[PDB]
């Protein structure tokens, strides 16, 4: 009964875009900034709507990360949210399912950042813990990413990648990972 | 009779994915590497048609950069393309045209970089030379781009300064 859309940034209307916003700050709990709402945008979104109302959604953002020394074209997981009433029926898990599509016709590695208890929804569609340190540009340097490590998941389904291997993600506002 | 789509990468038919390389190929003359074509997969594509014929490509990639100290959400153009038989007819124009909206719609600057002979497309279409410092990653550390100063090119739907400094995110190839 849930309908799957995915929508680049550029195909939105504003009142999607602000439907969006709406549904992940009600879907955070106040747990999401404008920075992390400006993370969400420029890439490919899934939505998923209950009839014409947005009830779950999430987005994958192109970054351009280092594996150890090797340019990596990444596939970046951001904004994942369901509404709370919508919760516990597979929605979340459709989300990642076309995610994971998009990720394998699209870029060289799935990433992202999840909560200690949202990594069994990613490690159910494939998703592991990454192994390697992470580091992020502060002032044009790199530093280590240290609160992120251990939380990082990747995918790369049947693919040849080194997840013990170190990623340096590219410059951004509020949190990098 | 040319008619225009705006596809994610994710959504091209196979057929259209070697359709492009195809074009790109015999459009740039030689002058179009692998790592070029990797470059202009992962964002949004352009694409110019005749009847059913591909003649036309532009893609739009998302880059994170710094502008001086700030972050910035960069459009990035790449694979700008038209059949030869159909140049000089306004497709790319159009393609641009088509470039600036969905730039102006997901980040806060566009960004390319354009060939000597080649900057008078862009401009008649808003865009500028790049008058600041250009920067990219090589072992991890940032080095000038002297190759590109002059030849990279921004536009900003908008309050920019175009004597800051940019430093671009890493790939492979032409990092510019
Ligand atoms: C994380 C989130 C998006 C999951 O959305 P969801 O639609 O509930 O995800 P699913 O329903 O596919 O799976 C969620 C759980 O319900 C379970 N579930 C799914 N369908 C079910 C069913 N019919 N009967 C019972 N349990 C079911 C799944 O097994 C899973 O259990 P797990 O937590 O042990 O894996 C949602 O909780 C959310 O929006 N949280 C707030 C924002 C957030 O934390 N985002 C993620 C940041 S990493
Ligand atoms: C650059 C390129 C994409 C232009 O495609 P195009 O469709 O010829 O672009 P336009 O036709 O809109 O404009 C091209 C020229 O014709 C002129 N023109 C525009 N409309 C015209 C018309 N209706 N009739 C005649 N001339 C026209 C433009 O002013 C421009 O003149 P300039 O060469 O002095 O800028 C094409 O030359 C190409 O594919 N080159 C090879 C790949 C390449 O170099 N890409 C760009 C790298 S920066
Ligand atoms: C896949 C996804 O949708 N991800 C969202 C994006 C969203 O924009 C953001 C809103 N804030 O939240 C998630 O991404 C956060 C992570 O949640 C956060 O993790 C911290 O917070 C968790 C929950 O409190 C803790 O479990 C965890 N140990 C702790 O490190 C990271 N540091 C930064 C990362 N951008
Ligand atoms: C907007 C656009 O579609 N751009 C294409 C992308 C394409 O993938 C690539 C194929 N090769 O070409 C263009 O982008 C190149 C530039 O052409 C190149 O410029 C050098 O070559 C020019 C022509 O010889 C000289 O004029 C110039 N002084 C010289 O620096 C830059 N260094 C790197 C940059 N990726």
């Not at 029926?89 to 990720?103: C, E, P, S």
């Not at 340190?133 to 080194?162: C, H, N, P, T």
Request: aromatic share 10%; glycine share 12%; net charge negative.
């Amino acid at each position: 009964g849930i309908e799957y859309r995915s929508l680049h940034t550029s195909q939105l209307t504003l009142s999607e875009k602000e439907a969006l916003y709406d549904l992940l700050i009600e879907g955070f709990e106040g747990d999401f900034s404008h920075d992390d709402f400006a993370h969400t945008l420029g890439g490919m979104h899934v939505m998923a709507f209950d009839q014409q109302k947005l009830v779950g959604h999430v987005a994958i953002i192109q970054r351009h990360m280092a594996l150890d020394n090797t340019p990596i074209s990444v596939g970046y997981v951001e904004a994942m949210v369901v509404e709370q009433s919508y919760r516990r029926q597979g929605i979340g898990r459709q989300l990642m399912l076309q995610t994971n599509k998009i990720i394998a016709s699209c870029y060289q590695l799935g990433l992202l950042s999840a909560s200690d208890d949202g990594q069994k929804l990613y490690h159910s569609v494939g998703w592991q813990i990454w192994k390697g340190k992470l580091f992020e540009l502060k002032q044009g340097s790199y530093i280590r990413s240290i609160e992120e490590e251990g939380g990082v998941m990747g995918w790369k389904a049947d693919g040849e990648v080194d997840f013990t291997a170190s990623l340096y993600c590219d410059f951004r506002g509020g949190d990098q990972w």
